[PDB]
Short mmCIF file of C-alpha atoms in Angstrom, two decimals:
data_model
loop_
_atom_site.label_atom_id
_atom_site.label_comp_id
_atom_site.label_asym_id
_atom_site.label_seq_id
_atom_site.Cartn_x
_atom_site.Cartn_y
_atom_site.Cartn_z
CA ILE A 3 -1.99 37.53 29.53
CA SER A 4 0.55 38.89 27.07
CA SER A 5 3.23 37.02 29.03
CA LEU A 6 1.33 33.77 28.41
CA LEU A 7 1.21 34.35 24.64
CA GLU A 8 5.01 33.99 24.41
CA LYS A 9 7.58 31.73 26.03
CA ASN A 10 7.75 32.03 29.81
CA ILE A 11 8.96 30.06 32.84
CA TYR A 12 5.43 29.56 34.22
CA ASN A 13 4.39 26.20 35.63
CA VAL A 14 0.70 26.76 34.95
CA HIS A 15 -1.98 25.08 37.04
CA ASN A 16 -5.51 24.56 35.78
CA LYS A 17 -8.47 22.41 36.78
CA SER A 18 -8.61 21.43 33.10
CA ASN A 19 -7.34 22.61 29.72
CA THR A 20 -9.69 22.96 26.73
CA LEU A 21 -8.06 23.03 23.27
CA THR A 22 -9.91 24.67 20.37
CA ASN A 23 -10.75 22.22 17.58
CA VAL A 24 -8.62 23.42 14.66
CA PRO A 25 -7.68 21.84 11.30
CA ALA A 26 -3.91 22.35 11.66
CA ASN A 27 -1.21 22.92 14.28
CA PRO A 28 -1.73 26.63 15.13
CA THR A 29 1.98 27.28 15.84
CA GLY A 30 3.68 24.63 13.70
CA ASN A 31 5.88 23.60 16.62
CA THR A 32 6.68 20.02 17.59
CA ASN A 33 5.95 20.80 21.27
CA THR A 34 2.50 22.34 20.75
CA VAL A 35 -0.54 20.42 21.97
CA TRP A 36 -3.68 21.04 19.91
CA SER A 37 -7.05 19.51 19.04
CA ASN A 38 -7.66 18.30 15.48
CA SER A 39 -11.07 19.22 14.00
CA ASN A 40 -10.58 16.98 10.94
CA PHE A 41 -12.04 14.14 13.05
CA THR A 42 -15.19 13.91 15.15
CA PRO A 43 -14.71 13.46 18.02
CA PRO A 44 -11.53 15.54 17.65
CA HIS A 45 -8.02 14.13 18.01
CA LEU A 46 -5.42 15.20 20.56
CA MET A 47 -2.19 16.20 18.79
CA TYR A 48 1.36 16.83 19.98
CA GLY A 49 3.17 18.51 17.13
CA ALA A 50 2.38 16.30 14.14
CA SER A 51 1.76 13.23 16.32
CA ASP A 52 -1.89 12.15 16.53
CA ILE A 53 -2.19 10.85 20.09
CA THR A 54 -5.88 9.92 19.81
CA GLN A 55 -5.42 7.93 16.62
CA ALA A 56 -2.37 6.11 18.00
CA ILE A 57 -4.27 5.25 21.21
CA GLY A 58 -7.22 3.95 19.22
CA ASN A 59 -4.93 1.82 17.07
CA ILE A 60 -3.37 -0.07 20.01
CA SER A 61 -6.60 -1.55 21.35
CA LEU A 62 -5.99 -4.96 22.92
CA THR A 63 -8.18 -7.62 24.47
CA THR A 64 -7.05 -11.02 25.71
CA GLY A 65 -8.42 -13.97 27.65
CA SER A 66 -10.05 -17.27 26.75
CA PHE A 67 -13.34 -18.75 25.58
CA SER A 68 -14.85 -22.18 26.17
CA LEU A 69 -14.87 -24.35 23.03
CA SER A 70 -16.77 -27.61 22.52
CA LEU A 71 -15.51 -29.81 19.68
CA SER A 72 -17.05 -33.09 18.53
CA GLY A 73 -17.05 -35.67 15.77
CA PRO A 74 -14.88 -38.78 16.01
CA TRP A 75 -14.97 -39.01 19.81
CA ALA A 76 -17.54 -40.80 21.96
CA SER A 77 -18.48 -37.45 23.56
CA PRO A 78 -17.64 -33.79 22.88
CA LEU A 79 -14.42 -32.39 24.33
CA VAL A 80 -14.52 -28.98 26.03
CA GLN A 81 -11.46 -26.78 26.61
CA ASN A 82 -10.67 -23.09 26.95
CA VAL A 83 -9.00 -21.54 23.90
CA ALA A 84 -6.71 -18.59 24.63
CA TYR A 85 -6.87 -15.47 22.48
CA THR A 86 -5.34 -12.06 21.92
CA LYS A 87 -6.79 -9.35 19.68
CA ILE A 88 -4.69 -6.26 18.89
CA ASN A 89 -6.43 -3.86 16.53
CA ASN A 90 -7.68 -6.28 13.82
CA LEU A 91 -5.05 -8.98 14.52
CA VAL A 92 -6.10 -12.19 16.33
CA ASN A 93 -4.12 -15.01 17.89
CA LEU A 94 -5.78 -18.25 19.02
CA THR A 95 -3.79 -20.72 21.12
CA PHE A 96 -5.47 -24.13 21.47
CA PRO A 97 -4.89 -26.60 24.31
CA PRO A 98 -4.87 -30.34 23.47
CA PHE A 99 -8.09 -31.90 22.19
CA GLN A 100 -7.49 -35.67 22.12
CA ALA A 101 -9.53 -38.76 22.88
CA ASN A 102 -10.17 -42.16 21.41
CA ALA A 103 -12.27 -42.14 18.25
CA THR A 104 -15.48 -44.18 18.17
CA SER A 105 -16.49 -43.00 14.67
CA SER A 106 -14.81 -41.67 11.54
CA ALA A 107 -15.42 -37.93 11.21
CA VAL A 108 -13.90 -34.50 10.92
CA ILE A 109 -13.67 -32.45 14.13
CA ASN A 110 -15.91 -29.41 14.32
CA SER A 111 -17.56 -26.92 16.61
CA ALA A 112 -21.10 -25.65 16.42
CA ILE A 113 -21.83 -22.62 14.29
CA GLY A 114 -21.07 -19.47 16.26
CA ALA A 115 -18.44 -21.11 18.47
CA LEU A 116 -15.76 -18.50 17.79
CA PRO A 117 -16.57 -15.26 19.66
CA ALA A 118 -18.08 -12.72 17.28
CA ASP A 119 -15.15 -10.30 17.48
CA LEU A 120 -12.67 -13.04 16.47
CA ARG A 121 -14.57 -14.29 13.40
CA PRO A 122 -13.11 -13.64 9.93
CA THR A 123 -14.97 -10.82 8.18
CA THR A 124 -12.61 -9.94 5.31
CA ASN A 125 -12.66 -13.59 4.21
CA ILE A 126 -15.22 -16.40 4.36
CA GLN A 127 -12.62 -18.78 5.80
CA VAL A 128 -8.97 -18.67 6.86
CA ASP A 129 -6.92 -21.87 6.62
CA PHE A 130 -3.88 -23.14 8.54
CA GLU A 131 -1.64 -26.20 8.35
CA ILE A 132 -1.33 -27.85 11.77
CA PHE A 133 0.02 -31.10 13.26
CA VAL A 134 -2.75 -33.60 14.12
CA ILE A 135 -2.78 -37.11 15.61
CA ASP A 136 -5.01 -40.07 14.76
CA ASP A 137 -5.28 -43.32 16.72
CA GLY A 138 -2.01 -42.51 18.48
CA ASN A 139 -0.23 -42.20 15.14
CA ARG A 140 1.60 -39.02 14.11
CA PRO A 141 0.78 -38.67 10.38
CA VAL A 142 3.30 -36.92 8.15
CA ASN A 143 0.64 -35.05 6.17
CA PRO A 144 -0.47 -31.85 7.94
CA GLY A 145 -3.93 -31.48 9.31
CA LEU A 146 -5.96 -28.42 8.36
CA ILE A 147 -7.94 -26.00 10.54
CA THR A 148 -10.46 -23.71 8.85
CA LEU A 149 -11.96 -20.75 10.72
CA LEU A 150 -15.28 -19.79 9.14
CA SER A 151 -16.97 -16.39 9.08
CA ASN A 152 -20.04 -17.89 10.79
CA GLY A 153 -17.85 -18.80 13.79
CA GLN A 154 -17.60 -22.53 13.11
CA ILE A 155 -14.21 -24.17 13.57
CA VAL A 156 -13.40 -27.29 11.54
CA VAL A 157 -10.29 -29.47 11.97
CA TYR A 158 -9.51 -32.03 9.26
CA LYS A 159 -7.10 -34.96 9.44
CA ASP A 160 -5.52 -33.79 6.15
CA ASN A 161 -5.89 -31.08 3.51
CA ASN A 162 -8.28 -33.23 1.44
CA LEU A 163 -11.25 -33.09 3.85
CA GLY A 164 -9.72 -36.02 5.72
CA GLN A 165 -11.57 -37.59 8.62
CA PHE A 166 -10.19 -38.94 11.86
CA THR A 167 -10.54 -42.70 12.16
CA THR A 168 -12.21 -45.03 14.66
CA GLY A 169 -9.59 -46.41 17.00
CA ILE A 170 -7.76 -46.00 20.26
CA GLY A 171 -4.50 -44.20 21.02
CA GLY A 172 -5.78 -40.64 20.73
CA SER A 173 -7.19 -38.65 17.82
CA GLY A 174 -7.09 -34.88 17.60
CA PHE A 175 -4.13 -32.59 18.23
CA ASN A 176 -1.40 -31.38 20.55
CA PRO A 177 -1.54 -27.66 21.41
CA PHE A 178 -1.06 -25.30 18.48
CA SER A 179 -1.49 -21.64 17.65
CA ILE A 180 -2.76 -19.66 14.65
CA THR A 181 -2.68 -15.92 13.93
CA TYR A 182 -4.77 -13.91 11.43
CA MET A 183 -6.44 -10.58 10.76
CA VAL A 184 -10.22 -10.69 10.75
CA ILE B 3 -0.80 35.56 36.67
CA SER B 4 0.12 34.59 40.22
CA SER B 5 -3.20 32.74 40.56
CA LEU B 6 -2.22 30.53 37.60
CA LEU B 7 1.08 29.56 39.25
CA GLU B 8 -0.61 27.65 42.08
CA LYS B 9 -3.70 25.46 42.39
CA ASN B 10 -6.93 27.10 41.24
CA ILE B 11 -10.37 26.07 39.99
CA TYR B 12 -9.82 27.51 36.50
CA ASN B 13 -11.07 25.60 33.46
CA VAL B 14 -8.57 27.21 31.10
CA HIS B 15 -9.27 27.56 27.38
CA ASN B 16 -6.55 28.03 24.79
CA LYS B 17 -6.29 27.73 21.01
CA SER B 18 -3.21 25.59 21.70
CA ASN B 19 -0.78 24.87 24.53
CA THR B 20 2.98 24.95 23.91
CA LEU B 21 5.09 23.06 26.48
CA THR B 22 8.71 24.22 26.89
CA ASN B 23 11.15 21.42 26.15
CA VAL B 24 12.76 20.67 29.53
CA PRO B 25 15.02 17.84 30.78
CA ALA B 26 12.91 16.90 33.83
CA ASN B 27 9.36 17.21 35.16
CA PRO B 28 9.35 20.86 36.38
CA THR B 29 7.04 20.12 39.34
CA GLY B 30 7.73 16.44 40.03
CA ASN B 31 3.99 15.75 40.17
CA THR B 32 2.24 12.81 38.53
CA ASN B 33 -0.45 15.15 37.11
CA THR B 34 1.96 17.55 35.36
CA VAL B 35 2.10 17.54 31.55
CA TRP B 36 5.50 18.50 30.13
CA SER B 37 7.71 18.15 27.06
CA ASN B 38 10.97 16.21 27.36
CA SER B 39 14.12 17.78 25.83
CA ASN B 40 16.23 14.64 26.33
CA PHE B 41 14.85 13.53 22.94
CA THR B 42 14.69 15.26 19.57
CA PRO B 43 11.94 15.63 18.55
CA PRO B 44 10.76 16.03 22.16
CA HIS B 45 8.52 13.58 24.03
CA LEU B 46 5.12 14.29 25.57
CA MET B 47 5.19 13.42 29.29
CA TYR B 48 2.51 13.04 31.95
CA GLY B 49 4.17 12.75 35.33
CA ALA B 50 6.92 10.17 34.81
CA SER B 51 5.02 8.53 31.94
CA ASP B 52 6.55 9.07 28.49
CA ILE B 53 3.52 9.06 26.18
CA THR B 54 5.57 9.49 22.99
CA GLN B 55 7.95 6.65 23.82
CA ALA B 56 5.17 4.29 24.87
CA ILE B 57 3.33 4.87 21.60
CA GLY B 58 6.60 4.50 19.68
CA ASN B 59 7.45 1.22 21.40
CA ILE B 60 4.28 -0.24 19.96
CA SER B 61 4.68 1.52 16.57
CA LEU B 62 1.54 -0.04 15.10
CA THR B 63 0.41 0.37 11.50
CA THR B 64 -2.30 -1.56 9.69
CA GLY B 65 -4.12 -1.55 6.38
CA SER B 66 -3.66 -3.34 3.08
CA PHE B 67 -1.60 -3.20 -0.09
CA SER B 68 -2.49 -4.17 -3.63
CA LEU B 69 -0.67 -7.32 -4.76
CA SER B 70 -0.41 -8.62 -8.33
CA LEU B 71 0.46 -12.33 -8.60
CA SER B 72 1.06 -14.27 -11.81
CA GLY B 73 2.40 -17.49 -13.26
CA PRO B 74 0.04 -20.38 -14.00
CA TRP B 75 -3.01 -18.23 -14.80
CA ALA B 76 -3.88 -16.63 -18.12
CA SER B 77 -3.58 -13.15 -16.57
CA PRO B 78 -2.35 -11.72 -13.26
CA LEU B 79 -4.67 -11.77 -10.27
CA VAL B 80 -4.78 -8.54 -8.25
CA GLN B 81 -6.11 -8.41 -4.68
CA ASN B 82 -5.49 -6.48 -1.48
CA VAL B 83 -3.35 -8.21 1.15
CA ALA B 84 -4.11 -7.10 4.71
CA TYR B 85 -1.24 -6.32 7.06
CA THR B 86 -0.43 -5.30 10.61
CA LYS B 87 3.02 -4.16 11.73
CA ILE B 88 3.80 -3.79 15.45
CA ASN B 89 7.37 -2.65 16.13
CA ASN B 90 9.29 -5.28 14.09
CA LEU B 91 6.45 -7.85 13.97
CA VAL B 92 4.41 -8.26 10.75
CA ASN B 93 1.21 -10.12 9.97
CA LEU B 94 0.02 -10.66 6.39
CA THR B 95 -3.50 -12.01 5.81
CA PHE B 96 -4.06 -13.04 2.18
CA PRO B 97 -7.47 -13.24 0.48
CA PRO B 98 -8.05 -16.03 -2.07
CA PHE B 99 -5.89 -16.03 -5.20
CA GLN B 100 -7.24 -18.76 -7.47
CA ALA B 101 -8.09 -19.19 -11.15
CA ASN B 102 -7.75 -21.82 -13.83
CA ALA B 103 -4.18 -22.59 -14.90
CA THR B 104 -3.19 -22.29 -18.56
CA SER B 105 0.49 -23.04 -17.90
CA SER B 106 2.62 -24.87 -15.35
CA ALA B 107 4.42 -22.37 -13.14
CA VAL B 108 5.06 -21.23 -9.60
CA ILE B 109 3.09 -18.18 -8.44
CA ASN B 110 5.07 -15.01 -7.88
CA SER B 111 4.91 -11.25 -7.60
CA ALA B 112 7.24 -8.71 -9.11
CA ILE B 113 10.38 -7.81 -7.19
CA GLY B 114 9.48 -5.05 -4.74
CA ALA B 115 5.83 -6.08 -4.38
CA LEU B 116 5.90 -6.33 -0.60
CA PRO B 117 5.93 -2.79 0.86
CA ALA B 118 9.45 -1.86 1.93
CA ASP B 119 8.59 -1.72 5.64
CA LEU B 120 7.27 -5.30 5.56
CA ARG B 121 10.30 -6.86 3.82
CA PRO B 122 12.57 -9.24 5.74
CA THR B 123 15.86 -7.55 6.64
CA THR B 124 17.26 -9.88 9.31
CA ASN B 125 16.89 -12.79 6.87
CA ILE B 126 17.08 -13.16 3.09
CA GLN B 127 13.81 -15.11 3.03
CA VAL B 128 11.20 -16.31 5.52
CA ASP B 129 9.29 -19.51 4.76
CA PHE B 130 5.82 -20.77 5.72
CA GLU B 131 3.82 -23.96 5.16
CA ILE B 132 0.37 -23.15 3.73
CA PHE B 133 -2.55 -25.06 2.19
CA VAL B 134 -2.71 -24.66 -1.61
CA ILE B 135 -5.00 -26.02 -4.33
CA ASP B 136 -4.26 -27.14 -7.89
CA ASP B 137 -6.81 -27.90 -10.62
CA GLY B 138 -9.53 -27.99 -7.98
CA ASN B 139 -7.66 -30.70 -6.08
CA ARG B 140 -6.70 -30.33 -2.42
CA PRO B 141 -3.19 -31.86 -2.22
CA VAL B 142 -2.10 -33.35 1.09
CA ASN B 143 1.45 -31.96 0.83
CA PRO B 144 1.70 -28.34 2.04
CA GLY B 145 2.43 -25.51 -0.31
CA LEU B 146 5.20 -23.08 0.56
CA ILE B 147 5.25 -19.29 0.60
CA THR B 148 8.61 -17.53 0.68
CA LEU B 149 8.90 -13.81 1.46
CA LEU B 150 12.14 -12.44 0.05
CA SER B 151 14.18 -9.48 1.27
CA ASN B 152 13.87 -7.85 -2.17
CA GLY B 153 10.09 -7.76 -1.70
CA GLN B 154 9.24 -10.63 -4.05
CA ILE B 155 6.60 -13.11 -2.91
CA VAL B 156 6.74 -16.67 -4.26
CA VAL B 157 4.13 -19.38 -3.69
CA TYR B 158 5.01 -22.98 -4.57
CA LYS B 159 2.71 -25.95 -5.00
CA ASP B 160 4.92 -27.97 -2.60
CA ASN B 161 8.13 -27.65 -0.58
CA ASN B 162 10.24 -28.94 -3.50
CA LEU B 163 9.87 -25.88 -5.79
CA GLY B 164 6.66 -27.41 -7.12
CA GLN B 165 4.69 -25.74 -9.88
CA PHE B 166 0.96 -25.38 -10.26
CA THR B 167 -0.35 -27.35 -13.22
CA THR B 168 -2.30 -26.55 -16.39
CA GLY B 169 -5.95 -27.46 -15.98
CA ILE B 170 -9.46 -26.42 -14.96
CA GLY B 171 -10.64 -26.35 -11.37
CA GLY B 172 -8.73 -23.58 -9.64
CA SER B 173 -5.05 -23.25 -8.78
CA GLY B 174 -3.70 -21.07 -6.00
CA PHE B 175 -4.94 -20.85 -2.43
CA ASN B 176 -7.76 -20.21 -0.01
CA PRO B 177 -7.14 -17.35 2.44
CA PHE B 178 -4.25 -17.83 4.85
CA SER B 179 -2.17 -15.79 7.25
CA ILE B 180 1.53 -15.63 8.13
CA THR B 181 3.36 -13.75 10.89
CA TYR B 182 7.05 -12.89 11.16
CA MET B 183 9.55 -10.34 12.38
CA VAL B 184 11.43 -8.48 9.68
CA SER C 4 -11.45 35.91 32.76
CA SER C 5 -10.44 35.83 29.10
CA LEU C 6 -8.73 32.47 29.72
CA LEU C 7 -11.92 31.05 31.28
CA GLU C 8 -13.87 31.16 27.99
CA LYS C 9 -12.96 30.42 24.37
CA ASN C 10 -10.19 32.64 23.05
CA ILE C 11 -7.67 32.70 20.20
CA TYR C 12 -4.66 32.48 22.56
CA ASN C 13 -1.74 30.22 21.73
CA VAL C 14 -0.71 29.78 25.37
CA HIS C 15 2.85 28.91 26.36
CA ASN C 16 3.83 27.32 29.67
CA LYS C 17 6.85 25.54 31.10
CA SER C 18 4.42 22.82 32.20
CA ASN C 19 0.70 22.33 32.72
CA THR C 20 -0.61 20.75 35.94
CA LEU C 21 -4.13 19.26 35.80
CA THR C 22 -6.15 18.91 39.00
CA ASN C 23 -6.90 15.28 39.83
CA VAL C 24 -10.70 14.99 39.55
CA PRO C 25 -13.18 12.12 39.25
CA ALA C 26 -15.04 13.50 36.20
CA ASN C 27 -14.44 15.71 33.16
CA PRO C 28 -14.70 19.28 34.57
CA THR C 29 -16.30 20.72 31.41
CA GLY C 30 -17.93 17.67 29.84
CA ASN C 31 -16.35 18.52 26.49
CA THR C 32 -14.61 16.14 24.09
CA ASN C 33 -11.70 18.59 23.68
CA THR C 34 -10.89 19.04 27.39
CA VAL C 35 -7.72 17.52 28.83
CA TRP C 36 -8.05 16.48 32.48
CA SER C 37 -6.48 14.19 35.09
CA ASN C 38 -8.61 11.30 36.39
CA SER C 39 -8.43 10.65 40.16
CA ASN C 40 -10.38 7.38 39.95
CA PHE C 41 -7.01 5.70 39.34
CA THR C 42 -3.68 5.77 41.15
CA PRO C 43 -1.51 7.07 39.64
CA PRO C 44 -4.08 9.30 37.90
CA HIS C 45 -4.99 8.88 34.23
CA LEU C 46 -4.52 11.46 31.50
CA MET C 47 -7.88 12.04 29.80
CA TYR C 48 -8.96 13.84 26.63
CA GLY C 49 -12.73 14.03 26.74
CA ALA C 50 -13.75 10.47 27.59
CA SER C 51 -10.59 9.01 26.01
CA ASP C 52 -8.31 7.49 28.68
CA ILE C 53 -4.79 7.79 27.28
CA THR C 54 -3.05 6.25 30.31
CA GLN C 55 -5.34 3.20 30.35
CA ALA C 56 -4.84 2.45 26.66
CA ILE C 57 -1.06 2.56 26.92
CA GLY C 58 -1.05 0.52 30.14
CA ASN C 59 -3.23 -2.15 28.53
CA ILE C 60 -0.53 -3.22 26.04
CA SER C 61 2.97 -4.34 27.11
CA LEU C 62 5.48 -4.99 24.31
CA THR C 63 9.07 -6.22 24.61
CA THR C 64 11.33 -7.24 21.74
CA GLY C 65 14.89 -8.27 21.02
CA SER C 66 16.78 -11.51 20.48
CA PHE C 67 18.34 -14.35 22.46
CA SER C 68 21.27 -16.61 21.66
CA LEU C 69 20.22 -20.19 20.87
CA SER C 70 22.50 -23.24 20.60
CA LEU C 71 21.03 -26.17 18.64
CA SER C 72 22.67 -29.55 18.15
CA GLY C 73 22.07 -33.11 17.04
CA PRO C 74 22.83 -34.19 13.47
CA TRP C 75 25.67 -31.71 12.95
CA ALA C 76 29.35 -32.17 13.76
CA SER C 77 29.13 -29.34 16.32
CA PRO C 78 26.38 -27.09 17.72
CA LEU C 79 25.10 -24.13 15.72
CA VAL C 80 24.63 -20.88 17.66
CA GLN C 81 22.48 -18.04 16.30
CA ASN C 82 20.28 -15.26 17.64
CA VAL C 83 16.53 -15.90 17.56
CA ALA C 84 14.41 -12.74 17.34
CA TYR C 85 11.35 -12.35 19.53
CA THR C 86 8.42 -10.06 20.30
CA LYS C 87 6.21 -10.43 23.37
CA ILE C 88 2.96 -8.46 23.61
CA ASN C 89 1.15 -9.19 26.87
CA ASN C 90 0.88 -13.01 26.74
CA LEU C 91 1.52 -13.29 22.97
CA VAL C 92 4.95 -14.36 21.67
CA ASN C 93 6.53 -14.36 18.22
CA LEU C 94 9.81 -16.16 17.51
CA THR C 95 11.59 -15.58 14.19
CA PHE C 96 14.43 -18.04 13.54
CA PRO C 97 17.41 -17.40 11.24
CA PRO C 98 18.74 -20.34 9.18
CA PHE C 99 20.24 -23.27 11.08
CA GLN C 100 21.81 -25.57 8.46
CA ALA C 101 24.97 -27.64 8.23
CA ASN C 102 25.96 -31.07 6.99
CA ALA C 103 24.81 -34.00 9.10
CA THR C 104 27.38 -36.43 10.51
CA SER C 105 24.81 -38.43 12.48
CA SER C 106 21.10 -39.15 12.33
CA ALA C 107 19.31 -37.17 15.03
CA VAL C 108 16.58 -34.68 15.81
CA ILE C 109 17.65 -31.07 16.38
CA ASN C 110 17.31 -29.78 19.91
CA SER C 111 18.41 -27.20 22.44
CA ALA C 112 19.26 -27.72 26.08
CA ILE C 113 16.50 -27.40 28.68
CA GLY C 114 15.87 -23.75 29.55
CA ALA C 115 17.07 -22.41 26.18
CA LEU C 116 13.90 -20.37 25.62
CA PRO C 117 13.94 -17.30 27.91
CA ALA C 118 11.69 -17.87 30.91
CA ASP C 119 9.16 -15.21 29.84
CA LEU C 120 8.68 -16.90 26.44
CA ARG C 121 8.11 -20.44 27.70
CA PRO C 122 4.65 -22.00 27.40
CA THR C 123 2.91 -22.15 30.78
CA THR C 124 -0.70 -22.83 29.77
CA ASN C 125 0.40 -25.89 27.78
CA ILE C 126 3.21 -28.42 28.18
CA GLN C 127 4.21 -28.05 24.52
CA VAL C 128 3.09 -26.00 21.52
CA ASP C 129 3.56 -27.46 18.04
CA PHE C 130 4.09 -25.91 14.59
CA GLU C 131 4.44 -27.21 11.02
CA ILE C 132 7.55 -25.74 9.37
CA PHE C 133 9.57 -26.33 6.19
CA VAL C 134 12.82 -28.25 6.86
CA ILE C 135 15.68 -29.48 4.64
CA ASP C 136 17.68 -32.72 4.89
CA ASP C 137 20.86 -33.53 2.95
CA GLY C 138 20.10 -30.67 0.57
CA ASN C 139 16.69 -32.16 -0.25
CA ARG C 140 13.46 -30.20 0.19
CA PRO C 141 11.08 -32.87 1.53
CA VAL C 142 7.38 -32.49 0.80
CA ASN C 143 6.39 -33.54 4.33
CA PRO C 144 6.52 -30.67 6.84
CA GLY C 145 8.99 -30.62 9.67
CA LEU C 146 7.78 -30.01 13.22
CA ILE C 147 8.99 -27.64 15.93
CA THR C 148 7.83 -28.22 19.50
CA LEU C 149 8.34 -25.59 22.22
CA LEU C 150 8.32 -27.17 25.67
CA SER C 151 7.29 -25.57 28.97
CA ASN C 152 10.77 -26.32 30.38
CA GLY C 153 12.23 -24.11 27.65
CA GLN C 154 13.62 -26.86 25.44
CA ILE C 155 13.18 -26.46 21.68
CA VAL C 156 13.01 -29.57 19.47
CA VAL C 157 12.92 -29.60 15.66
CA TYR C 158 11.99 -32.82 13.86
CA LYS C 159 12.48 -33.80 10.23
CA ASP C 160 8.79 -34.78 10.03
CA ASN C 161 5.71 -35.08 12.24
CA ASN C 162 6.56 -38.70 13.16
CA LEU C 163 9.56 -37.92 15.40
CA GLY C 164 11.67 -37.95 12.25
CA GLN C 165 15.42 -37.49 12.43
CA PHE C 166 17.72 -35.60 10.12
CA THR C 167 20.00 -37.89 8.16
CA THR C 168 23.76 -38.29 7.81
CA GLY C 169 24.84 -36.79 4.52
CA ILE C 170 25.92 -33.74 2.58
CA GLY C 171 23.89 -30.85 1.19
CA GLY C 172 22.69 -29.29 4.44
CA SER C 173 20.18 -30.35 7.09
CA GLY C 174 18.09 -28.01 9.20
CA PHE C 175 15.89 -25.16 8.04
CA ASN C 176 15.53 -21.89 6.20
CA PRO C 177 14.25 -18.99 8.34
CA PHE C 178 10.73 -19.40 9.70
CA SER C 179 8.48 -17.80 12.28
CA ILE C 180 6.00 -19.08 14.87
CA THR C 181 3.53 -17.22 17.09
CA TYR C 182 1.75 -18.40 20.25
CA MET C 183 0.39 -17.38 23.64
CA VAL C 184 2.29 -18.70 26.64
#
């Protein structure tokens, strides 16, 4: 045992290794593995590096969700919106939503459309300038997308609550992407 | 001792476990934990997997910093700006900064307001189109935020160095988010 | 036997080999073990799967040389910085500005974006950006479109606008765009 308490050449085998929960590195060395009792559950440490906290901080999910948008078009348009969430950071990448407009209206989803874990929580809405199209025209003013904390998505023709206009040629948007922390 | 040097059914307990810094996996096995002396400080290894390097390649931090902005308002507005940094990639998510304007001015921070590790270094400034408001109006032209390498943040009413304008209604911006590499 | 129950030993070893097992041998949140439900096995601390968390995120970063041309007398060549995390891409562009000797959009050749950064889910992805033309700072946004064939196009405005012959500089200050492929 005494030989294990100081440096040796032993390649130790064990079915498992249980590290006492302690508030500080017991040896002070950068190559000592220890278990940090300042957290519950405890954190695995390697020297001063907190492995458990680093692992928790690099959480990532990605995929898509179905989104139904409606307003100016004769019928709702349904497409899958791609997403990535890393820690608290979200990206949404939208495919095209475009069709002829039979009425004048903003584009919006139902309340709750954004998956719960992608909804803004620090802010009531988050706003982004995006390129939109109306009746086949490419307007020079930016459109505006607002993501709401209740999960509703609203897309305006311009920053001043602008509506898309009845007409043919395509109203809506080419693919775009927005990134934000919840 | 000899029983520890080959496979056993021991659930070993230790107050800590110090791994000799060595240049190669001493057993070659994918279930061997070791400490890699090819780096200083050393790297935690599991088999051929470099845990320290993998965590360092992500290098994620997140949180917020207090930001004081001033210009058109009677007094500075102070709010926390949320951030994520992943390797060289930064996200900033701003809460609302808006109040009545008693003078005509751009909005800016002090020099050094952006935390040092979020400041552009590859570029002298990085620019983003954002939706801004002035006197309660929602102008169709985008506002512009410029992040400067000296840590100053400037927000303009439009792309042409535009100033926010004296008046009641609210001047500044709804929440927005911008993403960039330093 | 003293090692098989709690002790105050700071143990040293040249390495530590953990038996591959399908479940935590002690049940405790401070036990390190090797999880045989995966190949290669996963390093565990309690119920925390260290190997899985690291394998779930894949980050690359660097830069690529980009040649843009159109309104300028000759192409401009600069490095564009990128990060890719799983399917998520950031591009951060340095300034591309010079005087314009013709009226034209700015574009790259086909295939200019590295293959692993090209949109595949969409044919193009569009972004509003601040551009400059003949030294003027126009209030209308410019537009960058990233195409699935790897071409990059930058327009003076959203309506296929071209940069304009003249002095003062045409192109853009640095900007950044982020998107999933």
